[PDB]
Design a protein around this ligand. Structure first.
Ligand SMILES: CO[C@H]1C[C@@H]2CC[C@@H](C)[C@@](O)(O2)C(=O)C(=O)N2CCCC[C@H]2C(=O)O[C@H]([C@H](C)C[C@@H]2CC[C@@H](O)[C@H](OC)C2)CC(=O)[C@H](C)/C=C(\C)[C@@H](O)[C@@H](OC)C(=O)[C@H](C)C[C@H](C)/C=C/C=C/C=C/1C
Length: 107
């Protein structure tokens, strides 16, 4: 569902717990294609709480297996992303997504 390839290693010990707020930088693109979003270019980290279905399953499960400081390439299959419906106007049906995610801190 989500494949994780490490860009930079974390501490290897500090992982997100259920109900914790994850602070991340991300860049998102369609596989081998167009970039659709970046928190890095606007210099504003993205915050979400784990275990609250706030983000796509691929990102949730990608961040959940990352330690603090880790940066990774997340390849997210459509079923762990926006599926056959897509995201209106931005993400097509059956789109595999690539997120470059850095887990900055947990709060
Ligand atoms: C302008 O930028 C948008 C985000 C854009 C939307 C379009 C996509 C290309 C994208 O560019 O982000 C993008 O890169 C993307 O695909 N993202 C964002 C980064 C995390 C991964 C993914 C995602 O899951 O987006 C999310 C995706 C689009 C929809 C969710 C997917 C998972 C599913 O379980 C949810 O059903 C509920 C819906 C959008 C979000 O990350 C926002 C934060 C979360 C929600 C809207 C819901 O969780 C909602 O549930 C009631 C909430 O609890 C929120 C906090 C309540 C308040 C009022 C809403 C705030 C909305 C903020 C919107 C923001 C910052």
């Amino acid at each position: 569902g989500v494949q994780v390839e490490t860009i930079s290693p974390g501490d290897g010990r500090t992982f997100p717990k259920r109900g914790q707020t994850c602070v991340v930088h991300y860049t998102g693109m369609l596989e081998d294609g167009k970039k659709f979003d970046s928190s890095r270019d606007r210099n504003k980290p993205f915050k979400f709480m784990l275990g609250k279905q706030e983000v796509i399953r691929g990102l949730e499960e990608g961040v959940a297996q990352m330690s603090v400081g880790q940066r990774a390439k997340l390849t997210i299959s459509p079923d762990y992303a926006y599926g056959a419906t897509g995201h209106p106007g931005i993400i097509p049906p059956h789109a595999t997504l690539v997120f470059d995610v850095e887990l900055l801190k947990l709060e």
